[PDB]
Design a protein around this ligand. Structure first.
Ligand code: CA
Length: 368
């Protein structure tokens, strides 16, 4: 297999989703910080270049009508990654793409919080992407965790699926966002919520013919600043273990994450239009929108009747290994520290990535 960049329109082939319906019957949301004006131009470039019908979008100011929803330049790259990867993974069609924009002028983390809140309150997107996060302990310290967890709990009860990137700092999330720290491990919020699907990162290898070859842990080592680039994973120090995670024996009574993983290495990342220019982008910021697009296809295949799927993922995958590509090689730390991949669920990558047609078959037979 291999390592190379990929048009996101290739992810259905890679994850065995070509035979499923598109997300044409499912509305998808994306949480952003600030506006998406350039992102929408880049999305038009994306759909036109690929010869696809245009995507129906809506942008939503989730806070004050006088809030700051101007474009954040770097943020455009994120909303580009998310939107193009979702539409690609979805087979080139979603019913509507909703950008839930956080006010940038609001106090503390309240803009982001109100963005989550709006998506849950409106309850129109079935699946919502969150390619963001930070040290759960910081979020815990200022009350943001507790506030946001209530919103996500509502989501799950409503049958919405929030998908959250697990982080890009490996085990060193709380050490100044990814500086190596020995045996001191931490995790990201909101991925550590038991009310979201946490999505980790892989190194994706494909055959010359573009088929799936294999996946290892995403760990690209240190950048020039000395920061680790690797898939977030471990367990929450605050959140209790939801009962469905009991199938992973020998772990603490805490929320383990991630749940599943998809492509995240920059070296095997997505080719994304950003301010009109193609760039090769990775991170768990990539992995999460891939999941969102694929899961939105299964929703469309199931009349958007699939509820919050965490429990079903754990029961089904633990009893049915063929539903996943099980990552077995690599680690998410540095210098010999960190968690190792292995057979079955592991801390770097969870269950690994989904084989979509096999999961669809499972759902047809068993529900979810
Ligand atoms: Ca594994």
């Amino acid at each position: 297999g291999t390592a190379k960049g990929h048009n996101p329109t290739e992810f259905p082939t890679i994850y065995d989703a070509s035979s499923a319906p598109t997300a044409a019957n499912t509305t998808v949301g994306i949480i952003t910080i600030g506006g998406v004006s350039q992102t929408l131009q880049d999305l038009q470039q994306f759909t036109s270049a690929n010869g696809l019908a245009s995507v129906n979008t809506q942008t939503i100011q989730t806070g004050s009508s006088n809030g700051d929803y101007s474009d954040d330049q770097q943020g455009q790259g994120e909303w580009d990654l998310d939107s193009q990867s979702i539409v690609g993974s979805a087979g080139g069609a979603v019913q509507q793409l909703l950008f839930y924009m956080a006010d940038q002028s609001a106090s503390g983390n309240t803009g982001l919080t109100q963005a989550f809140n709006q998506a849950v309150s409106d309850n129109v997107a079935k699946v919502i992407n969150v390619s963001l996060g930070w040290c759960e302990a910081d979020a815990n310290a200022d009350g943001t965790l507790q506030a946001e967890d209530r919103i996500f709990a509502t989501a799950a009860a409503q049958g919405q699926t929030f998908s959250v990137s697990s982080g890009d700092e490996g085990v060193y999330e709380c050490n100044n966002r990814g500086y190596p720290d020995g045996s001191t491990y931490s995790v990201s919020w909101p991925a550590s919520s038991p009310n979201v699907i946490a999505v980790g990162g892989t190194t994706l290898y494909t055959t010359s013919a573009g088929a799936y070859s294999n996946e290892t842990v995403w760990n690209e080592g240190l950048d020039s600043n000395g920061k680790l680039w690797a898939t977030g994973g471990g367990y929450s120090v605050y959140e209790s273990k939801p009962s469905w995670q009991s199938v992973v024996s020998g772990t603490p009574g805490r929320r383990l994450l991630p749940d599943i993983s998809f492509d995240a290495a920059q070296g095997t990342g997505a080719l994304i239009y950003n301010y009109g220019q193609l760039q090769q982008i990775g991170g768990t910021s990539l992995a999460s929108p891939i999941f969102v697009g694929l899961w939105a296809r299964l929703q469309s295949a199931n009349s958007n009747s699939l509820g919050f799927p965490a429990a079903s993922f754990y029961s089904a995958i633990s009893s049915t290994p063929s539903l996943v590509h099980d990552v077995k090689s690599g680690n998410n730390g540095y210098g010999g520290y960190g968690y190792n991949a292995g057979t079955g669920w592991d801390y770097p990558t969870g269950w690994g990535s989904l084989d979509i047609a096999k999961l669809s078959a499972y759902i047809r037979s068993n529900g979810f």
